């Protein structure tokens, strides 16, 4: 996308989202990132939504195929491997954008925590399909990114901040689903929920809606886990 203007890439990413063309959206946002300028709050959301939808489809397909494979020629394994490789390529692409050079230029809490949560998420997706000599290293890479994001968010953001809440939600899912630490997952979700509840009185009607929506997701997980 080197020949397209940054503003045109952003405008087309928004159009692609409206058209539910998430692969296009992701390619446009990849082009925007590669222009080398920092991303605004809105632009970070476009980048994240695009790739989350792309990899979300790949994860769903991989789970269908992995399930068929476990029930069971080489075809099912071969095709699961093809989907798995494509998923890993997307995760590697996102991680490459974060590393070159989104994270190192992100100084504000809102951008730095957001990018590090992203980094934890895409290593988590890599961990979901990992089975070799590096599942452990991938899990530790996810944990380290989430942990750095938590530390910053606890120091710099109020307990109701939606980025702080969604980071804690996903880190708790990491604990439960990847790290085999359900007690840590439950403790984190419950402490996050309780500290947000105690801060809701400070919020406007619209911020209250933003925060309580994510608190409900924490509660939903706790209901499933307990």
């Amino acid at each position: 996308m080197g020949s397209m203007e940054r503003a045109s890439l952003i405008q087309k990413a928004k159009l692609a989202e409206q058209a539910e063309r998430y692969e296009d959206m992701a390619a446009f946002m990849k082009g925007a990132v590669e222009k080398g300028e920092e991303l605004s709050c809105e632009e970070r959301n476009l980048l994240s939504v695009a790739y989350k939808n792309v990899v979300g489809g790949q994860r769903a397909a991989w789970r269908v195929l992995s399930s068929i494979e476990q029930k069971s020629g080489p075809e099912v394994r071969e095709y699961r491997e093809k989907v798995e490789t494509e998923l890993q390529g997307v995760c590697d692409t996102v991680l490459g954008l974060l590393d070159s050079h989104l994270i190192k230029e992100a100084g504000d809490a809102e951008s730095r925590v957001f990018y590090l949560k992203m980094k934890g998420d895409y290593y988590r997706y890599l961990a979901e399909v990992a089975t070799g000599d590096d599942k452990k290293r991938i899990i530790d890479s996810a944990r380290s990114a989430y942990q750095e994001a938590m530390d910053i968010s606890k120091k710099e953001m109020p307990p109701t901040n939606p980025i702080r809440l969604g980071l804690a939600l996903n880190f708790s899912v990491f604990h439960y689903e990847i790290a085999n630490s359900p007690e840590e997952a439950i403790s984190l979700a419950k402490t996050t929920f309780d500290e947000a509840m105690a801060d809701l009185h400070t919020l406007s009607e619209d911020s209250y809606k933003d925060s309580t929506l994510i608190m409900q997701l924490l509660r939903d997980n706790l209901t499933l886990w307990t």
Binding site: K52, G166, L169, V173, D220, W225
Partner: peptide, 7 residues
Amino acid sequence: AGSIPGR
């Protein structure tokens, strides 16, 4: 277990 949605 649900993770965070984008929108």
